[PDB]
């Protein structure tokens, strides 16, 4: 119960109005960013006034950047005197199953990892405010990982337009758009530096062999409908072959003992497939409904089994 559960206890103060206190009874399946793993904390360390720096509360793209400096935890039960949350990383429960709540507009599936994202969507940024205490609780949004990478991708691309539309998405035929918002340039700089260092290190000498195969793909996309759909209608490589004639050098330095493409894959995987984990946080949570259904709708709870 130290290893199985871990009851990190957020204390509730004395003076809270009964309309504000009963507003916390609808805060069941949430995500609370614990700074440490103390067994006794306060709402001020949980609320957004803990998140704010000196004079500056950052934007949504920066609001990711101190989630991953903290410990996400899910509220287990809202008592009148305290709020109990088990941290995700240490131990889930006795049996190891906690319930979240879809504050998403998006329906989940079983077995898919669930990433939690700041409130970026339109008509969605709902922060339960304590009027009796002047505290806001910016509850993040649990999302599917095929969305939660694109939503980070639209925000990072929006900041780099602003250094010289984009905020519209789709998911299973549901049109949805996120909040267009001005971004602090200090937040964009650590993001853009995190792109390039994972992009420069992802290039190896054997990748020039792969580059030669680009006109073979357009020779292949004229016959395979799978390749014709794979590239895109607006892909770069379809445009990067009509102006580009790639070639490989003849010999390799010590090219007898080393593998050109096998070294190309491992350096690619360690930096380019790894790159989505560095932008967002890791989806350490998936949903395994035991007996309910295969699709978990919005507003409903969902059972959670930890995710390696």
């Amino acid at each position: 119960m130290i290893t199985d559960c871990f009851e990190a206890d957020i204390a509730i103060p004395s003076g809270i109005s009964r309309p504000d206190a009963a507003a916390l009874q609808r805060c069941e399946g949430r995500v609370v960013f614990l700074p440490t793993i103390r067994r006794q904390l306060a709402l001020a360390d949980v609320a957004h006034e803990s998140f704010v720096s000196g004079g500056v509360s950052p934007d949504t793209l920066g609001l990711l950047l101190a989630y991953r400096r903290r410990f996400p935890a899910v509220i287990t039960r809202v008592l009148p005197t305290r709020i109990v949350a088990c941290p995700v990383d240490l131990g889930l429960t006795h049996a190891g199953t906690v319930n979240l709540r879809n504050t998403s507009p998006v329906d989940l599936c079983n077995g898919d990892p669930v990433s939690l994202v700041p409130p970026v969507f339109e008509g969605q940024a709902t922060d339960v405010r304590l009027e009796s205490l002047d505290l806001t609780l910016r509850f993040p949004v649990p999302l599917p990982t095929p969305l939660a990478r694109e939503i980070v991708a639209r925000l990072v691309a929006r900041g780099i337009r602003d250094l010289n539309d984009l905020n519209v998405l789709y998911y299973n035929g549901a049109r949805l758009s996120l909040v267009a918002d001005v971004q602090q340039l200090a937040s964009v700089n650590t993001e853009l530096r995190s792109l390039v260092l994972n992009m420069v290190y992802s290039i190896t000498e054997g990748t020039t062999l792969i580059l030669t195969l680009i006109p073979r793909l357009l020779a292949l996309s004229a016959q395979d409908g799978y390749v014709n759909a794979l590239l895109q209608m607006q892909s770069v490589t379809r445009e990067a072959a009509q102006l580009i004639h790639p070639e490989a050098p003849m010999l390799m330095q010590d090219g007898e003992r080393r593998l050109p493409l096998y070294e190309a894959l491992v350096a690619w995987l360690a930096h380019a497939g790894q790159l989505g984990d560095i932008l967002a946080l890791a989806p350490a949570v998936r949903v395994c409904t035991f007996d309910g259904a295969a699709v978990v709708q919005s507003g409903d709870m969902a059972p959670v089994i930890r995710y390696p």
Binding site: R69, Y201, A267, A282
Partner: protein, 350 residues
Amino acid sequence: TKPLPTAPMAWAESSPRELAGHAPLRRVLRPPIARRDTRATRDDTEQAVDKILRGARRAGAPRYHLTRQVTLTDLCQPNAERAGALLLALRHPTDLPHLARHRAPPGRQTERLAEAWGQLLEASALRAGLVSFNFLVAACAAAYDARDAAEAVRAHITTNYGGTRAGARLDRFSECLRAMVHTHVFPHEVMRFFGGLVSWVTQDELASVTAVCSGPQEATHTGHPGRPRSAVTIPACAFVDLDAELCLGGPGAAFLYLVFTYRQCRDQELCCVYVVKSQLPPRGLEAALERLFGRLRITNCTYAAFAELGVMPDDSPRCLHRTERFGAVGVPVVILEGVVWRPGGWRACA
């Protein structure tokens, strides 16, 4: 045996809730739902039979996963080092000469790692064994910041470890480590964590070491009934905080990590093994490695590699910094207290 500080003395026995929970269930009633509306021994061994009955009339208490391994006594010495040190398992070294032929960059001596490892087998003999942590500090002792306490590590190893010319084991294995980074086979690709020491079995040229691969430390019955207790000990050169160096003085559970530092130069390659205590997320750790160790970044692919080692569950975690005795040698040793071991995997460079 039923004292009269009862509410604590019954609380330590594993409560009143289990009595009251079985009260509405089992003590009452026919409901659940019903109709409506022979002089010295015996009795010495005879009460020991009754002690088995005392073992049977009854039976918190945390769990473990104890592990054992038949381990050669070349590199590590579980007799010389006390119970409560770190241990490190290895891959089998027949994979060493082939992986160096493919992972080393072009222009580098790939024959060097197979030769340096072969000289070690003829130097400790004057088979995937086990590396103890204190042995590893004297190997990477020529790269540290505090060099005198690294010599204090080197002072007891050359006098307490079983074998012939233990300093020749050190200076050859340190040559192996300089052949690791040169052939780009990084030591985190070889060094695997094996649990903290609790006990060992002595035999000629090999020892059967017991260890906890996952769990807490101090409540393992060590075998000694007077002291089933053994604290975790770390030498002072490897102990690195991030609560003091980053001004994070708040209470909270403190994590424990292993960290390798890599310096890639022409035949002058450094290795440093540190134990990093932190209040941080493991994903919120690589940025902290950028702030401190940027000197080995320029002289070099990353310079750092790390994995989880264990968690201190204390609210205010308590550390000690003493000078213990390994035989007759006083070594400044950072003694840790209350460690719950949970291993993990290393992180990548290339």
